[PDB]
Chains A and B, each alone.
Chain A
Amino acid sequence: SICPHIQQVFQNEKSKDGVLKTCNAARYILNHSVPKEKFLNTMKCGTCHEINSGATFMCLQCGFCGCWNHSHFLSHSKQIGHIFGINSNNGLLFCFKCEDYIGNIDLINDAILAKYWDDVCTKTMVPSMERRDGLSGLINMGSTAFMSSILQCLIHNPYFIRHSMSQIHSNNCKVRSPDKCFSCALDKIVHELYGALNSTNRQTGFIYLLTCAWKINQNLAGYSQQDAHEFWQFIINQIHQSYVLDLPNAQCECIVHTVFEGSLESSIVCPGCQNNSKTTIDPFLDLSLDIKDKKKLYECLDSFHKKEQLKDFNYHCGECNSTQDAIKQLGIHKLPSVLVLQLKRFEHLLNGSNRKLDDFIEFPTYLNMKNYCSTKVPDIIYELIGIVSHKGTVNEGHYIAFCKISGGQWFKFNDSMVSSISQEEVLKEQAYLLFYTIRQVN
């Protein structure tokens, strides 16, 4: 089941070290080449001179690059016997004798560890089958759906997973323990869902979290029904506070403040002379959008970004001296890596009650933020990765989470039930919170 050509090369330690060195070199070049150089020098066939004639492969043995579409690397490997090439779009190693990629050798996939590999193999193992995607249910402990729904979006967030598995918190944590430390409790959940702590399995970390949460805020600890947005904001604030607590020497550099933080530009404009000061800059960790009388998410972003003339604001223009009602606009000044949206699914009525807004709002699988940034603006596309939905009324209900992982697959998280679900069915849910991750900036 492994390419025998590469295994044959790997019999000799030096030859093996040579392959890994060239693979490391090719991949370093692919991540550190400006776009023009990358096209001209990694995607241009040495024989037909076309750019992107299908995949272009960089030879392991000489400096030649050859294309897929005209069989030009295949010719190189028959003419000269250089049978291994690296695909310049993704760094993957192809065997031209097998006519297949070599994707199932851990050392090649993890080549940046080549020099440590002896120690890596013996002390660490590959994930176990059922744990490899961290999919696991969190039992309802009373009214914990507002917790678990958010927890599932967090442990499927690629930025939070990388952070946790990189041991950044663990390495620096002063308080040391999942009983007292809220961050350590989060890390124990990841430990349990993707690793081994070594029916009601895999609930230990979630119990630890319930305990930490009780010590800080009993209302958000799972006894009574609460808001999922409020719990979301509670968790990230605890992550940030842990980081401040752990610094030797107390714009923030913690994981929350480098991933979820953007800023809004609020401008107040003279309708007299178009004077554009003073503009105010407010940070945000999420955007809360009004939805009344709307049917699409873009229409809700339009509303948030729409000019308002302020009728209760006392304005005096410093340029023209006008006292007309000023024009107010919110624009996005800085975008975050992960855009979190809360739909304001609730209204207050002048008869002294509140009611949920149950309207379906259409949300797209990829979101362009270009038309919402203040101040040409390029395409800025985020991919939808998580949805928290609420069923019930304003005062009582239940939360479910939907999250997206590699390979296009969505899962539905409803307390202890984790289920497979099609993208099509996810797009029909009543979204309360939406989690979008940056994909493309032109």
Chain B
Amino acid sequence: TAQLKSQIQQYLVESGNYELISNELKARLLQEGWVDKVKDLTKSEMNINESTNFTQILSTVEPKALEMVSDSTRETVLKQIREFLEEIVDT
């Protein structure tokens, strides 16, 4: 169920592991240049759109920003998450 995902998130927050995932993700994105790339993308989308309307800009930036995440960052963070999940779910 949907109740499962929230319980798990709640676990990751109370154990401190959520902050570790969230910091590590942020550190790696920053270092690979992705934050600066999203800022450059958003600037360009605003120019094209001729409007700063957040809903419109987000619908075009968001899919491209998700694709810009390096495979390296994506797998490293997925691992760190997976290892946290193995401690608390039954397989």
Contact = CB atoms under 8 A, between A and B. Distances in A.
A440 B36 contact: no
B6 interface: yes
Given A36-B19, A408-B40, A100 B54 contact: yes
A400 B7 CA distance: 55
Contacts of B10: 40, 49, 51
Given A100-B55, A442-B23, A39 B39 contact: no
Interface string B47-58: 000001111000
B24 to A, nearest CB: 8
Q: For the complex, would chain A's binding face be called helix, strand, loop or mixed by DSSP majority? A: mixed
Contact of B54 (A99, A379, A408, A439): A99
A366 interface: yes
Nearest to B51: A100
A224 B39 CA distance: 42
B13 interface: yes
A342 B30 CA distance: 24
A288 B37 CA distance: 31
Contacts of B13: 36, 39-40, 51
B52 to A, nearest CB: 8
Contacts of B14: 36
A188 B16 CA distance: 48
A101 B43 contact: no
Given A51-B10, A51-B13, A100-B55, A365 B23 contact: no
A440 B27 contact: yes
B4 to A, nearest CB: 11
Contacts of B76: none
B91 interface: no
Closest 7 CB pairs between A and B? A49-B6, A408-B39, A51-B9, A99-B55, A366-B31, A39-B13, A408-B36
14 contacts: A36-B13, A36-B19, A49-B3, A50-B9, A51-B10, A99-B54, A365-B33, A381-B30, A407-B43, A408-B36, A423-B36, A439-B30, A440-B23, A442-B23
Given A36-B13, A51-B18, A408-B43, 13 more contacts: A36-B16, A51-B9, A94-B54, A101-B54, A368-B31, A379-B24, A381-B31, A383-B30, A407-B39, A408-B36, A408-B40, A439-B30, A440-B23
Interface of A: 35-36, 39-40, 48-52, 94, 99-101, 103, 364-366, 368, 379, 381, 383, 407-408, 423, 439-440, 442
